[PDB]
Amino acid sequence: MTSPQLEWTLQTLLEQLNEDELKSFKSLLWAFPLEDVLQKTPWSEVEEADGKKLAEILVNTSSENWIRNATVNILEEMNLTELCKMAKAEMMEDGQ
Incomplete structure (x- = not known):
């Protein structure tokens, strides 16, 4: 587990998918049960x-x-x- 690469991996995926893709992604994110802090x-x-x-x-x-x-x-x-x-x-x- 890293710290820079940690957040970097996220951006890297989301820099590959975004154009009209992220619009979908956000909606799918709003379709799953948002847990506690995700609710806000x-x-x-x-x-x-x-x-x-x-x-x-x-x-x-x-x-x-x-x-x-x-x-x-x-x-x-x-x-x-x-x-x-x-x-x-x-x-x-998947390590620990």
């Missing part, structure tokens, strides 16, 4: 937030262990395998 997730930021900025909002709320699964589930919901398997290799490092 600043949509005002997420609105104008793109790519890096959106990743920032994910690490703004939850712990990496939740996010590393969270971001993946959204990609899964977008039928994104390719770049999601990048996340499954990087973000969600």
Whole structure:
């Protein structure tokens, strides 16, 4: 587990998917049960937030262990395998 690469992995995925993609992503994110702090997730930021900025909002709320699964589930919901398997290799490092 790292600290820079941690948040970097998020942005890297979200810099690959964003154009009209993030618009979907945000909506899918608003479709799953937002847990405690996610319930107050600043949509005002997420609105104008793109790519890096959106990743920032994910690490703004939850712990990496939740996010590393969270971001993946959204990609899964977008039928994104390719770049999601990048996340499954990087973000969600299954160690301990």
